[PDB]
């Protein structure tokens, strides 16, 4: 349909959809962390931090950090077996404490993934993940927030894509999904950077030691133009990734303004046969580069097939105003 049709249908679909009771949750989690180790920092990261708002059905993501992890706010998270084991060890303790403190809460320690994470479900509002000893999660969010503070209405695009990604099952937060919401944010941001809607922010200007464990909220003004800018952006975004972005040669990347190629990173077929993250192949089919991690494809789970599925969903998205019509 037209941008006008698209944009209006999206705004319509957003009625029930700020940072209300994340304080209360952050404090419940801080309670448990203090019991493990009173000197440990707790940080919020994830959509609450990225958007400056909390959306319906979004969990809350926390990370547990040592002071020296913070004060060294420009140094990478190590890949290694030991780092991964250290995180699971600290997470195992905290999970113990949470279950003691919250008999109603399911607290699950998830190992499959690259990053050790504890998933907590307590019905209703209680929905949160906790990770440990990793500043790139907070540094990635703060980068994404830096960009969204530049042009706050771009969050509407990112949010529209995020919901869609979940409806269609592309999102890794759904069973079968393969790209996390974070990956879709990088696309939206890379996309907007390409269209000159955002101004480049060198990842290296983001200091973790300066980030607020719980940043302030960012007022979310509903679209005044009946939604026409949004529909224009949704349409243009889907276009960009079907017909402009070349996935065979290009890397969705925030590390430099302009174009990044796969050859430049050695993100090639030869690299697939040498890799195996969590015992499995990494794929360089749909390339999305993590700004702070070493050599990490946020699209390592996008098989040649899922790349086809994605491309198919992108077409259908164009024809249905992101499945709103
Ligand atoms: O592979 C990842 C995924 C997430 N993050 C960090 C940066 C990201 O901005 C934040 C949270 O992203 P997530 O994909 O967990 O989604 P969300 O932003 O919390 O959205 P929602 O919770 O609505 O799915 O965690 C990473 O560094 N690497
Ligand atoms: Mg979240
Ligand atoms: Mg999460």
UniProtKB/Swiss-Prot annotation:
It is an enzyme of class 2 (transferase). Residues 230-295 form the PAP-associated domain. Binds 1 Mg(2+) or Mn(2+) per subunit. The type of divalent cation used by the enzyme affects the nucleotide specificity; Mg(2+) induces predominantly uridine (U) incorporation while Mn(2+) also induces substantial incorporation of both adenine (A) and cytosine (C). Terminal uridylyltransferase which, specifically, catalyzes the addition of Us to the 3'-hydroxyl group of single-stranded RNAs with a 3'-terminal U. The record marks 129 as: Important for catalytic activity. Changing residue 290 to A/N: Severe decrease in UTP binding. It comes from the Eukaryota. The gene is TUT4. Changing residue 45 to A: Loss of catalytic activity. Moderate decrease in UTP binding. PANTHER family: POLY A POLYMERASE CID PAP -RELATED, TERMINAL URIDYLYLTRANSFERASE 4. Keywords: Magnesium, Manganese, Metal-binding, Nucleotide-binding, Nucleotidyltransferase, RNA-binding, Transferase. Monomer. GO terms for biological process: RNA 3'-end processing. Mg(2+) binds at residues 59, 61. It comes from Trypanosoma brucei brucei (strain 927/4 GUTat10.1). This is Terminal uridylyltransferase 4. Changing residue 293 to A: Moderate decrease in UTP binding. RNA binds at residue 114. Its cofactor is Mg(2+); Mn(2+). One of its GO terms (cellular component) is mitochondrion. Changing residue 182 to A: Loss of catalytic activity. Severe decrease in UTP binding. Changing residue 114 to F: Loss of catalytic activity. It catalyses: RNA(n) + UTP = RNA(n)-3'-uridine ribonucleotide + diphosphate. One of its GO terms (molecular function) is nucleotide binding. Its EC number is 2.7.7.52. UTP binds at residues 47, 58-61, 137-141, 162, 166, 181-182. The keyword Magnesium applies.
